[PDB]
Design a protein around this nucleic acid. Structure first.
Ligand SMILES: [Zn+2]
Ligand SMILES: [Zn+2]
Ligand SMILES: [Zn+2]
Ligand SMILES: [Zn+2]
Lengths: 195, 195, 195, 195
DNA sequence: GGGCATGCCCGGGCATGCCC
DNA sequence: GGGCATGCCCGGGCATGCCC
């Protein structure tokens, strides 16, 4: 399938993503490495992503998430839930990797041409006095799942899009869904330093 | 379910919550830690919460209370009474965690969209010469109840809302419902200091 | 409810129960203490019980299992699944504690007078050259479950009964359903020796 | 599901299984440990099993093969192909673990009561001057496949059955389907000696 | 109020298909 | 064939309603 752009596009609204701290304890549920721009998280647990903007987006703006493989040689393959976690799946079709929890207006899409999956929620401006809005994503496979990601790293691309379809902002982060997010983040940062 | 705001909003009326002293004796029925902004109380016993405001709110103002899980990964789950304390329950539906005692005008609500529970009483201005009004809450499960809170900490969010539905003030506090509130408060304060 | 007999009755068929060895490693799935005549096992995992007899029972013989509380003061209370594990239960009614896995002819009974639960399977003589037959029981609550056993020890009574209803043999064993069967068996044997 | 007998039954025909030597080189395709009575083989590759008997069985005799889990706590679960290798499967239904290659008279069965899978071929007496007959089995999942065997050891039970359905002989062997059969056999034999 | 209970948490380390 | 991978196993120890 055709490859969506992953290139950062901060646009005129100064769109940026924020992530909590939660540190590097062995199986913390979700931890983000700024050095690697990489979230590390457990399957089927909340991943909070914050949306920051410099100016208010117009009414009807939507926030899309889609996963693509990071490596050149996998980039044209659609990222999907492996057959085991699809089967004993359960709103979200069981073939989608990324879900949003807690949003009565979530739309799950399958592109009719590229067959790529995405999940979309409306943009809501932060609470009357606050600095960002948070969306709760869930990844429903480990990166290692045989017959899904199969140990291939992915990027999640978050785009902010007006109701006309215009791209307003785009940012992406690498994701590793694993049993021990603290162990693995520390290992990868230390590999970056040594190698 | 969508997550209600927990962010403190003191608003134009200077809404604030007050709590008694009762100190830290092992099984005091209730005790509040200002250091941790946290209530330690026993199940099905009164928890006095005082409402302070700087100016009188308009007539028809209502005070709502609602529990949400504190940790990111539980935040989208609705807080409910466990099945044991619901079954041998008894005005308040048996699935609600928080009750108000002693208020002939109490309303128990289940949001038709979020399915979250709340309990609401009208705002009454303090007695002709007094400084705050007190509402008597009861929590009907221990934080540890298997199949309800399951040891997950909760926040109680108190909102002051006009009869039109406008948010006038909001404050929240963490709650631990346990058998020995004095032991546990002391333990947590001491954990805060060392760790 | 009236108390069923727990008294060992070896009868004319020389009915006796046998149990595997599996030793005392911390969370072994099921381990039996001959010193205490006590099986220690995890919830919803197989518990193999072997049936030994000196002479062949007649055709139509059935093997019943029923749980009763061990302590005098609880003996008249019916042993049942707690409300949490009944609710998210699922052949076996969700109120029964003991199930049999793997037996197309299992009958679950609720006594119309005593309201006690039992599960019954036909007696099958051992395989053409073998020494006992094995039935795979499952206990669907921990002994500690709040609103079910509530930390009260139970006995499981196994009776061998002819198709006319006559009691042919009866033996019983104490059960503790817990998260760490190896830890707990060792602890109890050591308590027996010291105290 | 009810558990089939795994007990060796050499019967009146002196039925026994034979296995090649192929030694312990790291990724040999198949290798058999007589010490552990265990087959170590790669997925979807031939596993030769020889059938030896002391007297010729009558005409119409059939040889059935079936997998059951070895550990007590898994024994009542039906052994099946995981969803990944079933989906991209392909005579043999894609849910069966064990196939026979090279036998125009193979029957694949699913028991209507136990739902267990088996594969059956007719017994052929050895070639006019030979000592055993060989059947070529294939296992279509690794023992480690997530959502199939999931790292649980299995036994393969081979039964020799007359055309009337009578059991004539039965023998079983443990199987580990893995990427490196020579490594793993050596490792397990060495674990047996020390531990 | 001092202290046991017991399902769960926690980091050290095995697993095993794959990489090199 | 030597060695990394990464979900899981494992025992030491915290938890917290209850016992004493
Ligand atoms: Zn998966
Ligand atoms: Zn409760
Ligand atoms: Zn239970
Ligand atoms: Zn497989």
């Amino acid at each position: 399938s055709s490859v969506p752009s992953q290139k950062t596009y901060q646009g005129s609204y100064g769109f940026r993503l924020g992530f909590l701290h939660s540190g590097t304890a062995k199986s913390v549920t979700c931890t983000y490495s700024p050095a690697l721009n990489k979230m590390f998280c457990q399957l089927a647990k909340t991943c909070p992503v914050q949306l920051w903007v410099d100016s208010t987006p117009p009414p009807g703006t939507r926030v899309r998430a889609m996963a693509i493989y990071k490596q050149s040689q996998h980039m044209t393959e659609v990222v999907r839930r492996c057959p085991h976690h699809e089967r004993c799946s359960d709103l979200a079709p069981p073939q989608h990797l990324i879900r949003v929890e807690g949003n009565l207006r979530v739309e799950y899409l399958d592109d009719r041409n590229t067959f790529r999956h995405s999940v979309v929620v409306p943009y809501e401006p932060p609470e009357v006095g606050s600095d960002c809005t948070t969306i709760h994503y869930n990844y429903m496979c480990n990166s290692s799942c045989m017959g899904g990601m199969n140990r291939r790293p992915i990027l999640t691309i978050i785009t902010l899009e007006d109701s006309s379809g215009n791209l307003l902002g785009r940012n992406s982060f690498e994701v590793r869904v694993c049993a021990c997010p603290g162990r693995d983040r520390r290992t990868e940062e230390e590999n970056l330093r040594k190698k």
